[PDB]
């Protein structure tokens, strides 16, 4: 009566969803997010939804060497 | 006289099983509904929380 998934795939597939609901499903909403993962974030880099940079979480050093400031100094307090 | 029916007898009563099906409780129209609500409501939040990020890179 109830089909076997590897002689028929997509009768079982409609069988456990109608039959096996919220055990289909879950399997189906679990899949979506491994694709929503593959497919959005490039179609995002296609319309041009850039990521926005990271925010800083520490005291932002600038590299290079020291600009030798004059200005502030003993004199001017 | 006794207590006798009218002359033309009394009416017939509703006596079948009504039970009317309505819009408001098949499951097209609320599986629509429910899938508009979580869309609209996900382009709320990915709206909020792009601009809380924003918030978040001026104060710090
Ligand atoms: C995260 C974990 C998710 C587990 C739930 C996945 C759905 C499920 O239970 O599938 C069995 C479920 C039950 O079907 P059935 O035909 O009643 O099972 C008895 C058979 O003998 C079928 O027996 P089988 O051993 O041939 O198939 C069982 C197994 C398939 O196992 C294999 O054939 C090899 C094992 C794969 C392991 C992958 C690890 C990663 O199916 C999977 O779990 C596939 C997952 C991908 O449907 C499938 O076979 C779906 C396969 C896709
Ligand atoms: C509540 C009361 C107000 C709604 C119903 C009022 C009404 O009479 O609306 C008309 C119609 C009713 O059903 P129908 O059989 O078409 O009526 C024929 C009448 N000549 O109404 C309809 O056909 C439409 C009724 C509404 C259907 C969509 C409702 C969506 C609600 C939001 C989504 C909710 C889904 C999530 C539910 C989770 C439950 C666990
Ligand atoms: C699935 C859930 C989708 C939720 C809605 C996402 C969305 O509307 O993203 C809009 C986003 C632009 O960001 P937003 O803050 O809305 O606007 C900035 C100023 N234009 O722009 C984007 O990120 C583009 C979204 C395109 C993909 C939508 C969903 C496709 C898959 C279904
Ligand atoms: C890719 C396709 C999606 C992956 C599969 C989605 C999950 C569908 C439901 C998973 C189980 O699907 C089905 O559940 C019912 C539970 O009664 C069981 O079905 C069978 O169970 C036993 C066999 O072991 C039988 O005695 C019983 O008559 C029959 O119902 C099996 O466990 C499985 O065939």
Redesign the interface.
């Given at each position: 009566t109830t089909p076997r998934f590897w002689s028929t795939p997509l009768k079982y597939c409609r069988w456990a969803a109608r039959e096996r609901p919220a055990l289909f499903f879950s399997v189906v909403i679990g899949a979506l997010g491994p694709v929503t993962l593959a497919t959005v974030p490039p179609l995002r880099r296609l319309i041009g939804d850039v990521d926005?940079a990271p925010?800083?979480?520490t005291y932002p050093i600038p590299p290079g060497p020291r600009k030798q400031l004059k200005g502030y100094d003993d004199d001017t307090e | 006289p006794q207590d006798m029916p009218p002359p033309g007898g009394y009416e017939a009563v509703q006596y079948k099983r009504n039970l009317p099906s309505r819009g408001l409780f098949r499951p097209r129209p609320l599986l629509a509904g429910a899938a508009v609500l979580m869309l609209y409501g996900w382009y709320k939040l990915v709206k909020g929380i792009?601009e809380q990020?924003?918030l978040?890179?001026e104060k710090?």
């Open positions: 926005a925010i800083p979480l | 792009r990020n924003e978040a890179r710090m």
